Structures are given as structure tokens and as C-alpha cells.
Design a protein around this ligand. Structure first.
Ligand SMILES: CCCCCCCCCCCCCCCCCCCC
Ligand SMILES: CCCCCCCCCCCCCCCCCCCC
Ligand SMILES: CCCCCCCCCCCCCCCCCCCC
Ligand SMILES: CCCCCCCCCCCCCCCCCCCC
Ligand SMILES: CCCCCCCCCCCCCCCCCCCC
Ligand SMILES: CCCCCCCCCCCCCCCCCCCC
Ligand SMILES: CCCCCCCCCCCCCCCCCCCC
Ligand SMILES: CCCCCCCCCCCCCCCCCCCC
Ligand SMILES: CCCCCCCCCCCCCCCCCCCC
Ligand SMILES: CCCCCCCCCCCCCCCCCCCC
Ligand SMILES: CCCCCCCCCCCCCCCCCCCC
Ligand SMILES: CCCCCCCCCCCCCCCCCCCC
Ligand SMILES: CCCCCCCCCCCCCCCCCCCC
Ligand SMILES: CCCCCCCCCCCCCCCCCCCC
Ligand SMILES: CCCCCCCCCCCCCCCCCCCC
Ligand SMILES: CCCCCCCCCCCCCCCCCCCC
Ligand SMILES: CCCCCCCCCCCCCCCCCCCC
Ligand SMILES: CCCCCCCCCCCCCCCCCCCC
Ligand SMILES: CCCCCCCCCCCCCCCCCCCC
Ligand SMILES: CCCCCCCCCCCCCCCCCCCC
Ligand SMILES: CCCCCCCCCCCCCCCCCCCC
Ligand SMILES: CCCCCCCCCCCCCCCCCCCC
Ligand SMILES: CCCCCCCCCCCCCCCCCCCC
Ligand SMILES: CCCCCCCCCCCCCCCCCCCC
Ligand SMILES: CCCCCCCCCCCCCCCCCCCC
Ligand SMILES: CCCCCCCCCCCCCCCCCCCC
Ligand SMILES: CCCCCCCCCCCCCCCCCCCC
Ligand SMILES: CCCCCCCCCCCCCCCCCCCC
Ligand SMILES: CCCCCCCCCCCCCCCCCCCC
Ligand SMILES: CCCCCCCCCCCCCCCCCCCC
Ligand SMILES: CCCCCCCCCCCCCCCCCCCC
Ligand SMILES: CCCCCCCCCCCCCCCCCCCC
Lengths: 236, 236, 236, 236, 236
């Protein structure tokens, strides 16, 4: 056949994302009633995260259909909200099953905001692109230190919940690996050679499968797993 | 009268599909509360599948109204999501009533992804149309081997659930026969003489009655049947 | 004043219908939880019927606003779905309160499909307008024989439910009288002198008050009546 | 500053109305679950009334944004539905707490339909504006006689419910005073000097605060009051 | 990079606000079921406030996308509704946990309406900008006197609820500090030098994070805190 053009792929992946995310949202929000009540905030936050994301992709697809332009800087609108919601999920899931300092919520949320807002300043010309990279990468390595070596990590080890053991590990691996895409997108788009925006929209669209959807399913399986482990122990 | 033009049929069948699918979705999601809880994920997945599908048809009808073009390659956006959701339904329904290796979920989902992604590469010019056919047909014969001769089949026979006996058979017959349309659409559109896109949009629209809606109703009757069989046995 | 033009009435009645139907839908779907559970499918089907209908009217009003044309042939999109849903309601309501052969569901649904699809072929030029009339009229007299002289009738008499006695009679009278509009619309528009499309859009819009909304309220009162009769007998 | 133009006010009040009404709707529909079940139809009808109204204002604001015209005759689309729903509320609230002839429902609904349909005929040029006034005013004085001197009045006095005593009085005062706006709008716009349509749109928009929203809150407080009085008496 | 233009920021912050607010709304409305029933009106009012706000931002973003203009006077549409809903929250939260005169509801709501309507008259040219400032500032200092030195304050001290102690303080600090933005916006835009509308849209958008969202979360934590304190005391 005649190859599809990246412009055709850019637009279709906005629809794909839009659909998958509204799907994930509704699923997470209808399955909110079948998990224990200890899991209800986790599931609401999950499902709302997917919805915000979906509304972004709806806004973006219309911009694209109308104009044929979808700047990369627009991605910070989504990430200011949804990357914050995803980081704070670590706290929410821990408060479902153990006791944890509320300080942790704030540590986590600040790191997320630093990581998005720093990269947004370099991207939008308000400060050097070099500096917004460094700040974005610092705000991310902080979040990693929280979850690998900090309170969230310890709380996790000392929870005793085997559902949370698995969520923490899986969510952490997505943030460690999945979320590496964001510093690297930035590095190339800004500090490096540069990258076609079409290419980078495709990349950012296709990685929101991992970074948002698999992230969701991991949370969902924890809530489901746990709900059931509590039922299986009631039987005994 | 003066015959309707296929262009008129193409556009109306997008509306028809849109309506039927939002209908099916809402029905499946409101009837989610009247089935046993063992059936709740099945019903949520069902209803969300219908919703994704509906949102596609909404996206497509607007493209059509605006442009009068509805490429066939756009169908892979729907199928990447909804054909995967339908294949994994076999697993979901089995996990409602029996114990099944989680491996099966992945076998099933990979086959679906191979079958859609392979046919999408040949369709969009990234690899030979011949090869995307072969791969799509392989990804489909795999799914069939799963459900006719593989674990899903055995799990089904050894479940003992008579609701699931009936779902499996009916869902299997739709995949065996209903889903033959997709390899054959592809074969003709790409590897064969060729086919008017209007004609093929009509065909793909009218077969989503079977492939999506009757598929849904089959799942719904199983969940309903079973819910009731459990109530009828509680009375004794 | 200066008379409104039928074009002004055509467009306003699309809005009226749209509003009334989304209203009816939401009401039927929120009152689904206050009827017995034996009535839940009836109420979901009712409310979904109204919703499909509403989405049609939304699609049509946009076509009208944009183009000032609203072909009559577009009505078959609605009727293929909603006339089938309304005919099968007879079965659904009977299965709420008595035992009935599942065959009846199919008898009923085939008649509905014959009646819509036959008149759609004559309307869209695929077969003689004469023949599509005859077939549409045959598919309708069949449905009437079902409900006046056939199993549905007997099941109704032998149910003993006084709520269903009333629904059956009222729904039957709407199909006997209300639905006469459809053969006659067809006869005039196609086989007869002809009729302004504006006039006929107005007529079809204003009769969806009877044919859809009063039809709904009749079903709703049965479910409500019965739910209450069961509560009043529990008190004794 | 430089005065806002009435055109600017007309358009903003459509948005204001739209927002307030979708707000009221959702509130009434979520608070439907916290009132006694005897109040559930009242609350569903309330919330659906607000929703129909909101959908009107959405339809109208788009017409305005596109065209800069919002005829007054368009108001009869809303009023044919929502004035009927509001009049029949008297019956619904009485059937929540006492026994009342079903005849009353019909008396009430006919008066509403006469009052809207008569004024719509004079407005749209089908009969003399004089006569449509007289008929609209007759259909309104009838409704008033029902609720001041007729069965609804008696049923209210003989109910004994103090929540309903208060609703009836408040709803009656809105219909007596609030709804006087409609005959007077009509009189001036048609039978009298005439009135700028911008002015009259503003007036009709700002009076739907009373006539729809305060009307709603009155119903809501009755349902709430009563629900609570029944709980306070259960404690004793 | 090349700096983003304030026009680019104005449009993106409308989307940001839109997304965050629909997010907050849905979260507050799904978490309505996990708080005590004493908190249900608070949570419904909260979530509906967020929704009205979101619908505004949707209306505004379309105006902007179409026209590139977003007058500041449009903000009074939102504030007439949502500032009233936020002020009356003080009453709603007090009626959740203590007994309070219904008079307070009205004191509070009048202050809110005076504060918005006065500033809207000066803004839209109907009265001197000076006078609309004074009135807006008076309507605000009144609300502050209510909540710092008036009944609401006393009711709060005499409630004994420690969740409400915290909400009152936090909501009060947002109104004292957060809401200072509104008098000062007005002062500068109208009575003072003047201010770019782009700048002021950015400022008003970014302060609806505090003034609406943090306001919400404060209410949500009170309802959550309390619900739990009541569960923890039931255990003892
Ligand atoms: C008793 C169980 C009933 C489950 C009802 C769940 C409904 C809430 C989840 C759906 C919310 C969708 C929000 C869409 C908003 C889009 C704008
Ligand atoms: C028991 C202690 C509390 C547990 C649950 C806490 C629930 C909070 C969940 C909502 C957090 C949302 C954070 C969204 C960040 C958006 C920030 C945008 C700034 C521009
Ligand atoms: C301890 C839980 C705190 C939850 C409040 C969420 C604040 C959201 C800010 C954006
Ligand atoms: C919360 C986001 C962090 C942004 C820090 C900006 C630092 C700029 C310093 C040099 C100018
Ligand atoms: C702060 C940089 C990211 C920390 C990574 C974690 C290092 C070791 C974890 C051991 C388990
Ligand atoms: C049992 C495992 C199923 C988890 C859901 C996985 C969904 C992945 C979407 C690509
Ligand atoms: C019976 C099911 C209906 C099939 C499709 C009807 C499509 C008709 C749309 C016609 C649009 C413009 C015609 C002039
Ligand atoms: C042990 C019980 C487990 C039940 C698992 C429920 C998971 C259902 C949701 C699965 C959806 C998977 C298909 C998602 C479609 C998109 C995948 C690839 C897109 C590129
Ligand atoms: C899991 C999805 C994989 C689908 C495509 C697999 C095959 C890609 C093409 C291989 C041959 C290229 C030469
Ligand atoms: C020609 C105009 C639009 C083409 C849309 C292409 C869709 C590309 C993305 C498909 C992703 C699913 C592949 C499996
Ligand atoms: C019950 C008999 C099963 C025969 C299976 C036929 C082959 C399935 C699909 C091809 C692999
Ligand atoms: C038992 C009879 C119900 C059958 C399920 C509905 C089929 C719908 C087909 C369109
Ligand atoms: C009694 C209610 C019936 C309403 C019928 C329809 C009236 C709609 C009129 C819309 C007029 C638009 C343009 C008029 C100039
Ligand atoms: C046995 C208990 C009752 C179960 C019946 C469930 C009925 C579900 C609704 C049936 C749907 C009717 C068919 C609507 C679509 C018609 C097919 C369109 C073909 C183009
Ligand atoms: C499901 C019923 C479909 C409608 C009946 C169609 C009959 C067509 C007869 C054609 C005769 C051609 C000469
Ligand atoms: C030109 C009119 C001819 C109509 C033929 C009569 C068919 C009526 C249906 C018979 C049952
Ligand atoms: C009551 C008994 C009615 C008998 C006659 C019904 C005739 C309707 C059949 C139409 C063909
Ligand atoms: C007791 C009244 C029940 C019927 C209500 C609806 C009547 C039709 C509405 C038009
Ligand atoms: C206090 C409520 C104010 C309602 C009217 C607001 C109208 C403003 C719209 C102006 C847009 C163009 C300048
Ligand atoms: C017990 C849980 C309470 C959930 C109630 C949810 C249903 C009420 C909200 C329905 C909103 C309907 C709005 C549809 C608008 C269509 C256009
Ligand atoms: C309790 C017995 C009487 C029934 C009470 C409910 C009345 C029917 C529901 C209201 C129907 C709304 C009609 C709107 C007209 C347009
Ligand atoms: C003036 C209108 C009177 C309508 C009521 C008729 C009686 C209906 C009985 C049921
Ligand atoms: C001279 C013509 C006299 C016409 C009178 C028209 C009366 C219409 C009143 C509306 C009735 C609505 C049904 C109740
Ligand atoms: C009885 C209600 C109507 C009386 C007014 C008749 C019209 C007066 C002429 C203007
Ligand atoms: C309670 C006192 C009722 C006094 C009489 C009220 C007259 C209302 C009549 C309305 C016009 C017919
Ligand atoms: C009983 C406390 C007062 C609640 C009043 C309900 C809202 C009043 C009208 C809003 C405008
Ligand atoms: C993290 C900060 C989030 C605020 C985003 C500011 C708006 C960016 C939108 C830019 C639109 C670009 C058009 C060129
Ligand atoms: C069992 C829990 C179910 C809660 C469902 C209700 C949650 C609120 C959904 C309301 C969303 C309304 C969307 C606005 C419609 C108009 C735009
Ligand atoms: C127990 C006493 C009752 C407590 C609950 C009262 C519920 C009130 C909730 C609604 C208040 C909204 C009032 C502001 C709406 C905007 C008014 C705009 C006027 C132009
Ligand atoms: C409550 C309504 C608040 C309105 C405040 C406006 C007062 C206007 C004073 C004008 C003086 C010339
Ligand atoms: C309290 C009074 C509000 C301030 C008014 C100061 C005078 C304004 C003109 C500069
Ligand atoms: C809460 C104890 C401190 C009292 C502060 C009094 C001043 C409050 C602001 C009033 C505005 C007029």
C-alpha cells in the first residue's frame, strides 16, 4: 500500500488515546464498588486521573483536526494534573493499608510539581532549557528516592500487605522506566538535536499506554487482589 | 423511488452503529447490578467495550460528515482496543466460574494484538500487504486454537457451568464465522482485486451488529442465566 | 402575528423531541431502582429505547440546522432500533410476571424487522414502493396477530397480573392505532399523491409523543403498579 | 466603564441559566437517594425538569452564538414540557403523602397544556393573538382554581403533612406571582405596544431563577423536611 | 526556546481549569457515598459547585478559541453562582454537625450576592466603577464579619466537632486571603491604572486553583475526617 503519513498517525493516536482513556476511566469507576471500602479513594483517584487525561486528548484532537498543529508544550497541561495524581497514588495506596505520615503526601506532590513545572519553564522559554531539564530531572530523581529509599519505601516493606508489595514494585518500575521517556523527550526536543513534533506526539501518545493505562491496571489489580484476600481470610 | 446512494448508506450506518452501541453499552452497564457479583467485571468489560466502539463511530461519523472520506485503515483504532477486549472476555468469563491460569489472559491478548497489529502494518504500508495478511490470519487461527483445542477450551469443559458452556460455544462461533469477515475484508481490499471503500464501510458497519452486539448479548445471557441458576438452587 | 413557517416548526419539533426523550430516558432509568427487581430489565430497556431515540433526534437536528434537509428515509435508522425494542417489550414484560416461550421473543423481533426493513427497501429504491408497503404492512399485521390472538395474548390472559393486563391493553392500542401512522406515512409519501417532507417530519415528530413517550409511561405505570401491589400484599 | 449592550446580557444570561439549571438538576438527582422513598418520584421529576430546561438553554445559546437571534416563540418548546412538569408536581407531591384522585393529574396537565398551547397558537400566527392570550390566561386561572379552591387544595389541607403544607403554599405563590410574568410577556410582546426581544429574553431568563429554581428548592426542602420528620418520630 | 505568548497561556489555562474542575467535581461526587449521610449535602454542593465552574470554563474556552477574546465581565456569570455556593457552604457544614439558625443561610447568601452583583454593576457600566468596588468590598467584609465574629463563628466554636474546627479555619483563610484577589482584580482593572485582560485572565484562572479547588479539598477532608472519627468512636 502507500505508507500512512506521520500526520495520519498523529491524529489517529489522539483518537486511540481518547478512547482507551475514557474506557479505562469508566471501568475503574464502575469497579470502584466491588473493591473493599479501603480502596474506594484509590479507585476514584485512578478513574478520575484517566478521565482528565481523556479530556486532554479530546481537546488536543480538536486542535489538531482544526489546525494540524499539536504543540508539545501542550503536554504540560495534562502532566501538571495527571503526573501529580499518579505520584500521590503511592501515598493513597499506602494509606489504604497502613499508617503513613501525611508529610509524605506533600513530599510526593512537590516533587511531581517541581518536575512538571521546571520542564514547562524551559519548554515555554521562561528559563534556560538546560535549567528546566536539570530541575525536571531533579524533581524526578527525588520522587524515585522517595519510593526506592524513603518513607514510602519503608511503609511499603512494613505494611505486610502482599497486594501493595506488588503494586509498589510495579508502579515504581513504570516510574523508573516508563517515565524516563519524559526527560528524554525534553532532552531531545529542546537541549539536543531536536525532534519532529509529529514523531514526538506519536511517542508521547503511545507511551501513555504504559505510563497511564498499565499504571492503572496495576493499581486495579492490587485493590482487587486485596479485596479478595480479605474475603478468603473471612472464610477461615 | 430513486435509489439511495452508497454514500448515503455509509453515513447512516455510522449513525445506526453509534446509536446501537451507546444503547448496548448503557444497557450492559445498568444490568451490571442485577447479575451476581462474580459477573460484575464481565459486565463492566462488556459495556465498556460497547462504549469504546460507540466513541469510535462518533469520531468516524464526524470525519465523514466533514470530509466524505472514512478510510478503512481507521478501523484498526477500534479493533486494537475492542478486538482485544473481546478476546480476553473468554478469560474473564472463565475466571467468573472456575480457576484458570493467568497465562491464558496473555496468550489470548497477544493473539489479538498480533492479529490487529499485523493487519495494520500491511494496511498502512509499513510491510507487505501479503505479510500483514499472513500475520493477521496467524494471530486469528491462534486465538481459535486457544478456544477450540487449548486451555480455555478445557477450562470450559471442566467448569461444569451450563451458562458458560453456552457462552463459550456462541462466542466461539462468532469468532470462527463472524470474525472471518476481517481477514476477508483485508484480503480483498489489499491483496485482491480491491473493493470500493463505501462498500467495505457498509460491510464493516453491518457486521459490528454480529461481531459486537450479538457478542454482547451472548455474554449478557450467560451472566443472567447463571445469576438465576444460583438463585433457583438457593431456593432448594 | 406572522405565521411560523413549517420549516420553523420542523426544526423546533426536533428540539422538542430531543428534550422530551432525554427527559423520559433519565426518568425511566432513575426510577429503575424503585420498582421490583422483576421489572429492572423492562425499565432499562425502556430508558435505553428513549435514549436511542433522543440520540437520533440530536443527529437529525444537526443535519437540519446545517442543511435544512431532513429526509424521511432517515427515520428507518431510528425505527430499525426502537421499533424492535418496543415490540420485544411485550415479551420482556411477560417474562417479568409469567413463563413464556423464548420463541415468542423471536417471532416478535422478526415481525418488527420485517416491518421496518421492508418499508426501508421500498423507500430507498431497492424494491418497488408497492412491495415495501405490502411487506411493511404484513410485518405489522403479524405483530398484531401475535398480541391480539397469539401466544403473547394468551400468556397475558393467563398471567393473572392486573398490571400487565393494563400494560398489554394499552401498548396494544398504541400499536394498533398509534403505529398506523407509519403505514400511512409510507403509503402517502411513496405510493400515493406524495406529501411535503416538512409536513411529514412534523407529523412523525408529533406522533413520537404517543408512539414513544405514552408507550413508555404505560410500561412505567405497570412496573410501578405491580411493585406496589406486591408491597400491599406483603403487609397482609 | 462602557455599558454592556443588551445583546451581551442576552447571551450571558443564556449561559447563566444553562449552568444554574444543570447544577440544580444534578443536585436534585443526587439528593434523590437521601429522601424517603415516598419522595423519589418527586425528586426525579424535579431533577429531570431542570435538565430539560438546561438542554433548552444549551440549544438556545448555540442559536444565539451562531445567529444573534433568539426568537421568543422558541420559549414554547421549553414551556410545553417544563410548565406541564411543574403543574403536575402538585399531584406528585400529594401522592407522596396522601390519597388523591388520579383525575387530578389530568385536570392539572390539561390546564398546563391549554395555557401553553393557546399562547403558542397566538404567538405563531395560527390564531388571533387576542385569542391566544385569553386561552392562555384561562388555562392559568384554571390551574389556580385547582390549587386554591379545588381538590389539590383540599387534599393539601386534609393531608396533615406539614412539609406539604409549606410546599403547596410556596409553589402556589410562585405560580400566582412568578408565573404572572408569562401572560404579561405575551400581552406586551403581542397584544400591546410590543417589546424588544433582547429585553424580553433577559426578563424570561432572569425569571427562570424564580419560576424554575426557587420552585425546585421549595420541593426539595419539603422532601428533606419530611424525610427528617419521619426519622425524628421513629426516634420516639 | 521562544517564549510562549500570554495569549497561548490564556487559552491553555482555560483548558487546565476545565480539566481540573471536571476532575474535582467527579471525585467529590463519587466520594459522596463514603462519607456519613450527615455530609451528603455538603459533598453534593461541593461537586456541583466544581461542575458549574467547569461548564463556565468550557463556555469560555470556546469563546476564546473562536474569537481570541475572553472579557473579564464574563467572570460574573461564574461568580454569581459559585461564590454564592461557596459562602453558603459555611452554613451547610454547620448544619451537618450542630444546630444553626436558618437566618444564617440568608445573611451569608445576601452578602455573596451583594459582593458579586455590586462589582458586576460597576464592571458593566451600570453604576460608577468606584461604587461597585465599595459595594463589592462591603459585601465581602460582611461575609468576613459573619465568619470571624458572627453566628457562624460562634456555632463553629460551640460545635465541638474538630473536623469543622479545621474546615472553618481553612475556608476562612481562603476567603480572607484567596478571595482578596477579586477586589484587587476589580480595583486595578477598573478603578486603577488598568490591566491587560490576558494577564488578568491568567491570574483569575490560576487563582481558581486555590479559591475553588483547595477550598473543595478542605471541605472533603472535613467530611472524611469526621466520618472516620465517628467510626473510630463506634469501635470504642
Ligand atoms: C450501586 C452501583 C451503581 C454504580 C454507578 C456508578 C456511576 C458513576 C461512575 C460513572 C461516572 C461517569 C462520569 C462521566 C463525566 C463526564 C463529563
Ligand atoms: C487518610 C489520609 C488521606 C488519604 C486520601 C487523600 C486523598 C487526596 C486525593 C486527591 C489528591 C489530588 C492531587 C491533585 C494534584 C493537582 C495539582 C495541580 C496544581 C497546578
Ligand atoms: C492528607 C491528604 C491531603 C489531600 C488533600 C489534596 C490537596 C489537593 C491539592 C491540589
Ligand atoms: C515549582 C517549580 C520550580 C521552578 C523553579 C524555578 C527556578 C528558577 C531559578 C533561576 C531563574
Ligand atoms: C535518588 C535516585 C533514585 C534512587 C534509586 C534507588 C537506589 C537503590 C534502591 C535499593 C532497593
Ligand atoms: C488478570 C490480569 C489482567 C490485568 C489487566 C491487564 C490490562 C492490560 C491492558 C493492556
Ligand atoms: C433499515 C436500516 C437503515 C439503513 C440506512 C439508512 C440510511 C439513509 C440515510 C439517507 C441520508 C440522505 C438521503 C437523501
Ligand atoms: C483474575 C481476574 C482478572 C480479571 C481481569 C480483568 C481485566 C479486564 C481488562 C482487560 C482489558 C485488556 C485489553 C485492553 C485493550 C488495549 C490493549 C492494547 C492497546 C495497544
Ligand atoms: C504484539 C504485536 C506484534 C504484531 C506485529 C508482529 C510482526 C511485525 C512484522 C515482522 C516482520 C517484518 C519484516
Ligand atoms: C488516513 C487518515 C487517518 C489514518 C488513521 C491511522 C490509524 C493509525 C493508528 C493505528 C493504531 C492501531 C494499530 C493496531
Ligand atoms: C472440538 C473440535 C476442535 C477442532 C478445532 C479446529 C481447529 C481450530 C482453529 C485452527 C487452529
Ligand atoms: C432470552 C431472549 C433474549 C435474547 C437476547 C437479545 C438479543 C438481541 C439481538 C439484537
Ligand atoms: C406548544 C409548543 C409547540 C412548539 C412547536 C414548535 C415551535 C418552534 C418555533 C421555532 C421558531 C424558530 C424561528 C422563528 C422565526
Ligand atoms: C429471558 C428474559 C428477558 C431477556 C430479554 C433481554 C432483551 C434485551 C433487549 C433486546 C434488544 C432488541 C433488539 C434491538 C436491535 C434490533 C436489531 C437491529 C438489526 C439492524
Ligand atoms: C429480516 C426481514 C427483511 C425484510 C424482508 C425483505 C424481503 C425482500 C423481498 C424481495 C423480493 C424481490 C422481488
Ligand atoms: C397503488 C396501491 C396498491 C396497494 C396494494 C395493496 C397492498 C396492501 C397490503 C395488503 C395486506
Ligand atoms: C380481543 C380479541 C380480538 C380478536 C381479533 C384480533 C384481530 C387482530 C389481528 C390483526 C391481523
Ligand atoms: C398517574 C399518572 C401516571 C401517568 C403519567 C404520565 C402521563 C403521560 C405524560 C405525557
Ligand atoms: C451578575 C450576573 C451577570 C449576568 C450578565 C453577564 C453578561 C456578560 C457577558 C458579556 C460578553 C461580551 C462583552
Ligand atoms: C447511590 C449512587 C448515586 C448515583 C446517582 C447517579 C445518577 C444521577 C445522575 C444522573 C445524571 C444524568 C445526566 C445525563 C445528561 C444527558 C445529556
Ligand atoms: C402513586 C400513584 C400515582 C402515580 C404518581 C406518579 C405520577 C407519574 C409520574 C409523573 C409523570 C410526569 C409527566 C410529565 C408530563 C409532560
Ligand atoms: C377537564 C379535563 C378532565 C380530565 C379528567 C378526566 C378523568 C380521567 C379519569 C382517569
Ligand atoms: C376560531 C378558532 C378557535 C381555536 C381554539 C383553539 C384552542 C386550542 C387550545 C389548546 C388545547 C391543548 C390541548 C389540551
Ligand atoms: C378573561 C381573561 C382575558 C380577558 C382579556 C381579554 C383581552 C382584552 C383585549 C386586549
Ligand atoms: C385559601 C384561600 C382561598 C381563597 C380564594 C382563592 C381564589 C383563587 C382563584 C384563582 C382564579 C380562579
Ligand atoms: C433550610 C436552609 C435553606 C436552604 C434553601 C435552599 C436554597 C435557596 C434558594 C437558592 C437560590
Ligand atoms: C506546568 C504548567 C502548566 C501550564 C501550561 C501553560 C499553558 C501552555 C499551553 C500552550 C499552548 C501553546 C500554543 C503555541
Ligand atoms: C454508586 C455510585 C454512583 C455515583 C454516580 C453519580 C456520580 C455523579 C455523576 C454526575 C455527572 C454529571 C455530568 C454532567 C452532565 C451535563 C454536562
Ligand atoms: C437543614 C437546613 C438545610 C441545609 C441544606 C440547604 C441546601 C442549600 C444548597 C443550595 C444552595 C445554593 C444557593 C446559591 C445558588 C446560586 C444563587 C444565584 C442567584 C442569582
Ligand atoms: C442582593 C442584591 C445586591 C444588589 C447590590 C446592588 C445595589 C445597587 C445600588 C445602586 C445605588 C445607586
Ligand atoms: C470599605 C470602603 C471600600 C474602599 C473605598 C475606597 C475609595 C475607592 C476610590 C479610590
Ligand atoms: C476569631 C477571633 C479574631 C477576631 C477577628 C475580627 C476581625 C475579622 C474580620 C472582620 C471584617 C469586617
Amino acid at each position: 500500500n502507500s505508507t500512512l503519513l506521520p500526520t495520519d498517525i498523529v491524529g489517529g493516536t489522539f483518537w486511540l488515546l481518547s478512547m482507551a482513556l475514557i474506557g479505562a476511566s469508566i471501568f475503574f469507576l464502575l469497579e470502584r464498588n466491588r473493591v473493599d471500602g479501603r480502596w474506594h479513594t484509590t479507585m476514584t483517584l485512578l478513574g478520575v486521573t484517566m478521565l482528565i487525561s481523556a479530556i486532554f486528548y479530546y481537546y488536543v484532537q480538536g486542535m489538531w483536526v482544526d489546525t494540524g498543529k499539536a504543540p508539545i508544550v501542550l503536554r504540560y497541561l495534562d502532566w501538571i494534573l495527571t503526573h501529580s495524581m499518579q505520584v500521590v497514588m503511592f501515598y493513597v495506596i499506602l494509606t489504604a493499608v497502613t499508617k503513613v505520615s501525611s508529610a509524605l503526601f506533600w513530599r510526593l506532590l512537590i516533587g511531581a510539581l517541581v518536575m512538571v513545572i521546571g520542564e514547562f519553564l524551559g519548554a515555554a522559554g521562561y528559563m534556560s532549557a538546560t535549567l528546566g531539564f536539570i530541575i525536571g530531572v531533579v524533581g524526578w530523581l527525588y520522587i524515585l528516592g522517595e519510593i526506592y529509599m524513603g518513607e514510602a519505601s519503608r511503609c511499603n516493606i512494613e505494611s505486610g500487605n502482599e497486594a501493595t508489595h506488588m503494586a509498589f514494585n510495579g508502579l515504581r518500575l513504570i516510574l523508573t522506566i516508563g517515565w524516563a521517556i519524559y526527560p528524554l523527550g525534553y532532552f531531545i526536543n529542546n537541549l539536543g538535536g531536536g525532534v519532529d513534533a509529529n514523531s514526538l506526539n506519536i511517542i508521547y501518545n503511545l507511551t501513555d499506554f504504559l505510563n497511564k493505562i498499565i499504571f492503572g491496571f496495576v493499581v486495579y489489580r492490587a485493590a482487587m487482589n486485596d479485596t479478595q484476600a480479605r474475603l478468603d481470610e473471612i472464610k477461615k
